[PDB]
Design a protein around this ligand. Structure first.
Ligand SMILES: C=C1/C(=C\C=C2/CCC[C@]3(C)[C@@H]([C@H](C)CCCC(C)(C)O)CC[C@@H]23)C[C@@H](O)[C@H](C)[C@@H]1O
Length: 254
């Protein structure tokens, strides 16, 4: 019923997050040519043996993800309150949410036209098959695609998109956090901003119920995170795999 207006601070928080995102997410994907080149071997049969022997798309996707983790670190440092946390808690939050924020931010390149992440010409269009060529299986990929479509359908305003990523990163329920109280205080400030924004800026149908759907996406990410971790583990058993990854990727998922 009640629709309180966004406070001055809440307006500032949103402005800061929008700016942070615009500075860390290049909608033209102009840096991609700097990554090791994508290579797509003939694997129409989806052979795990072949996929693992070649890992043809791993160097490229590993670079794409490493590059993205760097952008996410930059985004997080601009989240109001994040710097108030200890560097130790900052690193714990970053490492545990990295893959989740990547999945969330990737929704901007994802398209329902053909269910792919389109980041330019054909070379930088990623499909389910490109992900299997990087050593992952459908157990992760299919739920990931479902998640992307579910997120697209929420038709989030950019304001809601950046707030969701911030809330995802500043979660008090991450293993190893020391000052959960502070982290939760910061998250609540963000969650209240989102709840308030939805109530007085998001037109129906969806003026309500949207918050719950967004929180549910965060739960969905936890599942995807666990499945990715399990699969990364398997991938790391492949001899010479480390050279196809990056130091940052090795640390974050190691
Ligand atoms: C990164 C991005 C991105 C797309 C994301 C994709 C497509 C290719 C596969 C990938 C990277 C999956 C894949 C399951 C993760 C595999 C990583 C390793 C190999 C380390 O286990 C997670 C998100 C998805 C492009 C831009 O949106 C932005 C630049 C974003 O940030």
């Amino acid at each position: 019923s009640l629709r309180p207006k966004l406070s001055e601070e809440q307006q500032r928080i949103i402005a800061i997050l929008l700016d942070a995102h615009h500075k860390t997410y290049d909608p033209t994907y102009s840096d991609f040519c700097q990554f090791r080149p994508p290579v797509r071997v003939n694997d129409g049969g989806g052979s795990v043996t072949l996929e693992l022997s070649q890992l043809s798309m791993l160097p490229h996707l590993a670079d794409l993800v490493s590059y993205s983790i760097q952008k996410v670190i930059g985004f997080a440092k601009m989240i109001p309150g994040f710097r108030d946390l200890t560097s130790e808690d900052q690193i714990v939050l970053l490492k545990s949410s990295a893959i989740e924020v990547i999945m969330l931010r990737s929704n901007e390149s994802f398209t329902m036209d053909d269910m792919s992440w389109t980041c330019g010409n054909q070379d930088y269009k990623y499909r389910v098959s490109d992900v299997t060529k990087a050593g992952h299986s459908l157990e992760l990929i299919e739920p990931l695609i479902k998640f992307q479509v579910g997120l697209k359908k929420l038709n989030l305003h950019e304001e809601e998109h950046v707030l969701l990523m911030a809330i995802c990163i500043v979660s008090p329920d991450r293993p190893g956090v020391q000052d959960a109280a502070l982290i939760e205080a910061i998250q609540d400030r963000l969650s209240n901003t989102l709840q308030t924004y939805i109530r007085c800026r998001h037109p129906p149908p969806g003026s309500h119920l949207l918050y719950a759907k967004m929180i549910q996406k965060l739960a969905d990410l936890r599942s995807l995170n666990e499945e990715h971790s399990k699969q990364y583990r398997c991938l790391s058993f492949q001899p010479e795999c480390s050279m196809k990854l990056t130091p940052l990727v090795l640390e974050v998922f190691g």
